[PDB]
Amino acid sequence: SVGLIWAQSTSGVIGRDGGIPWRLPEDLAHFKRLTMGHTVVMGRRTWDSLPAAHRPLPGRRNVVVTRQTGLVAHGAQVVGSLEQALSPAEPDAATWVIGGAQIYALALPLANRCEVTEVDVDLPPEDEDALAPVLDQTWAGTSGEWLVSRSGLRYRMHSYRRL
């Protein structure tokens, strides 16, 4: 099973300036709970965006997709395409594609589940922002209730599965 997991502003922003333009502890916790013990596949820019104590993501098999033959990514497995990332020598019951926008676009046709956090933060998109994938009619979903973070932002989780 191949799943995508991301958090986006309502406006569709997932990344800015090489990082994340909000802080949402409940989403970090959701992400860590869903992915612990499993494989996480990411693009090289997402690998470079990870803060020090999270590079590699502890307790997960980290797979980094790059065209740079020769890239060294201590704590991760480097592969040269998304198809390679999804063709492991050692299978995993759960593989999560964890970003960014470039890799989500390649992975969406291959995935059967998306776990989406929606963040009610007003972020007019800016020209270099990374943006969320768009789900078409081949996906159907369920939405949790709007919740308020301990840090103040409204947020909610959505779970989509391929029809």
Ligand X SMILES: NC(=O)c1ccc[n+]([C@@H]2O[C@H](COP(=O)([O-])OP(=O)(O)OC[C@H]3O[C@@H](n4cnc5c(N)ncnc54)[C@H](OP(=O)(O)O)[C@@H]3O)[C@@H](O)[C@H]2O)c1
Ligand Y SMILES: Nc1nc(N)c(OCCCOc2ccccc2CCC(=O)O)c(-c2ccccc2C(F)(F)F)n1
Report how many residues bind ligand X under the rule CB under 6 A: 27
Smallest CA-to-CA distance from 9 within 150, 131, 127 is with 131
Q: Please report where in the chains the tokens 């098999």 appear, as a residue.
A: 61
Taking the complex as a whole, the smallest distance from the CB of residue 111 to ligand X amounts, in Å, to: 14
**Beta carbons of 2 and 110 less than 8 angstroms apart:** yes
19: annotated binding-site residue?
A: yes
Does 44 bind ligand X (CB under 6 A)? Our answer is: yes
Residue nearest to ligand Y (CB): 7
Site for ligand Y in 98-117 (CB under 6 A): 98-99, 117
Ramachandran region, residue 25 (left: φ > 0; alpha: ψ -120 to 50; beta: rest): alpha
- Residue 21 has phi, psi (to 5 degrees) of -90, 35
61's contact among ligand X, ligand Y, none, with CB below 5 to 8 A by partner kind, is none
Beta-ladder partners of 130: 15
Please give the annotated binding residues for NADP(+), written as ranges.
7, 14, 19, 44-46, 66-68, 100-103
Interaction site with ligand X (CB under 6 A): 6-7, 14-15, 18-20, 42-46, 49, 65-68, 80-81, 98-103, 106, 130
